[PDB]
Design a protein around this ligand. Structure first.
Ligand SMILES: NC(=O)c1cccc2[nH]c(-c3cccc(C(=O)N4CCn5c(nnc5C(F)(F)F)C4)c3)nc12
Length: 237
């Protein structure tokens, strides 16, 4: 195999023929240099946005891959100049990833139980790395999970303090923002490739009347998303 070792180990993790397995993903995976500025930005995003009620583990980046799914860029194109783009987290159980890369992130079917989906059937993201890492569900026996960074064209946000359970946005809105009591420090956000990186440390958002501790970002068209990076994570408890 001509693949770089990190890519081969990631292939092993997601699938359990290494190059055939890699081709099965229909995804161009490349490794990010440990000494680059891209990597430093991603690691600072991980460092500063670890919530304080998620102190059961202590994160630690292992590998950082830049991923490009086939068609995802030409499918995301129409929503690109859409203002308010943000680079956000998405966690999921490891076995799901072999699919997430081949099919992309998807929405629950049109007739599933909308209960459990606090803000209706959509694609969810968080600006606190730990809020998403919780969904990797990585225990002490298997303390390695995968988490995605995605450019999300949030557009005009419908800001909500409580649950809705509906997937229909008031015309003029492109995404939902569940307002958390704690938000990344906006005085520290940067703009990487024109995408807003909210890597600021956790501060108080100023909203008292709200159900969520940390912000949630939901979209409802799967083409509002563009997966940029993929992270191997060591969970230390
Ligand atoms: N994980 C986050 O980054 C995340 C961040 C903030 C709020 C959130 N709410 C939910 C959520 C809300 C409702 C249902 C589920 C849930 O069972 N899955 C659906 C399937 N699936 C999951 N994680 N990935 C996927 C998949 F779409 F790729 F298949 C878990 C998950 N996930 C988040």
């Amino acid at each position: 195999s001509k693949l770089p070792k990190p890519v081969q180990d990631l292939i092993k993790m997601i699938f359990g023929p290494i190059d055939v397995n890699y081709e099965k993903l229909k995804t161009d995976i490349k490794v990010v240099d440990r000494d680059s500025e891209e990597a430093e930005i991603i690691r600072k995003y991980v460092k500063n946005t670890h919530a304080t009620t998620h102190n059961a583990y202590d994160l630690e980046v292992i590998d950082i891959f830049k991923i490009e799914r086939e068609g995802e860029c030409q499918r995301y194109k129409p929503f690109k100049q859409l203002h308010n783009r943000r680079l956000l987290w998405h966690g999921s159980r490891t076995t799901n990833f072999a699919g997430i890369l081949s099919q992309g992130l998807r929405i629950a079917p049109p007739e599933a139980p909308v209960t459990g989906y606090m803000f209706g059937k959509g694609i969810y993201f968080a600006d606190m790395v730990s809020k998403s890492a919780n969904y990797c569900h990585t225990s002490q026996g298997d303390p390695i999970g995968l988490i995605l960074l995605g450019e999300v064209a949030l557009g005009n946000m419908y800001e909500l303090k409580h649950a809705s359970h509906i997937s229909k946005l008031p015309k003029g809105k492109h995404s939902v923002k569940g307002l958390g009591k704690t938000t990344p420090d906006p005085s520290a956000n940067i703009s990487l490739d024109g995408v807003d990186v909210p890597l600021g440390t956790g501060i108080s958002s100023g909203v008292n009347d709200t159900s969520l501790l940390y912000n949630e970002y939901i979209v409802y068209d799967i083409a509002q998303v563009n997966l940029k990076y993929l992270l191997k994570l060591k969970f230390n408890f």
